[PDB]
Amino acid sequence: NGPESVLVNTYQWIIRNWETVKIQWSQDPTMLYNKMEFEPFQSLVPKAARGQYSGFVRTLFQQMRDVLGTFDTVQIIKLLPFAAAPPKQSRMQFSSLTVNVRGMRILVRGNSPVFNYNKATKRLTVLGKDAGALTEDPDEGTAGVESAVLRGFLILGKEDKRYGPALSINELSNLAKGEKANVLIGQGDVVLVMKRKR
Numbered sequence: 001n002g003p004e005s006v007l008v009n010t011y012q013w014i015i016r017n018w019e020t021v022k023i024q025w026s027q028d029p030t031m032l033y034n035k036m037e038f039e040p041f042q043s044l045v046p047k048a049a050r051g052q053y054s055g056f057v058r059t060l061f062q063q064m065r066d067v068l069g070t071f072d073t074v075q076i077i078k079l080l081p082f083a084a085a086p087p088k089q090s091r092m093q094f095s096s097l098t099v100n101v102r103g104m105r106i107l108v109r110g111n112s113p114v115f116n117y118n119k120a121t122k123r124l125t126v127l128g129k130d131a132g133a134l135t136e137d138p139d140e141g142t143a144g145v146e147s148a149v150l151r152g153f154l155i156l157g158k159e160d161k162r163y164g165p166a167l168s169i170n171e172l173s174n175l176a177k178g179e180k181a182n183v184l185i186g187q188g189d190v191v192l193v194m195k196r197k198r
Helices: 003-016 018-027 029-033 036-044 047-066 073-084
Strands: 096-099 104-107 115-118 123-126 129-133 153-158 180-186 189-195
Touching: 003 018, 003 036, 003 073, 003 123, 003 129, 018 029, 018 073, 029 047, 029 073, 036 073, 047 073, 047 096, 073 115
Parallel strands: none
Antiparallel strands: 096 104, 115 123, 123 129, 153 189, 180 189
16 A cells, blocks of 8 residues: 555556547547556655656657657556646656656656566566556557657667767757657667657
8 A cells, every 4th residue: 555556556547448548548638647546656756756747758759640650558647647737848758657656767768667568468566566458559659769759869770880879868959850869768778769750
């Protein structure tokens, strides 16, 4: 009882109700974001981060709506509870989002100890406990273009030496619209990104 249970139950709820969440996420996201079911999760989020995280995630979700062929079920499920605060817009980038449990990090890209989706089995494991199983979705984007990781950017694929040494996530704000660059996105992973034109 406490944080860990709120975390696990929140994601359990999303998975249980995925079909209606998916509909609302696409047709009326504001009302999805305003559901009472996300309030307990929001209390886990550091008070001073809630607005920042919401602005960030809401923009990442609109990028996914705006950039055809980049639908990512697991990414939507992972980031959704963070959209539930009144958004505070900024130019900050986040590689992880913190929930306070016992100060734990949910990685924005890929799996983490806290949030682990097992593709082979379709099971989501949160804090080592079962949150439920997904089903294969035909709407899933297969281009390897990731639209909901960086605010204002698309991840294109592997590092490409034509575009020079890798930048940190804090160093992307000088890039021109349409410009490409390599980025230390996390771990030791370097990826080619593009700054969006709109």
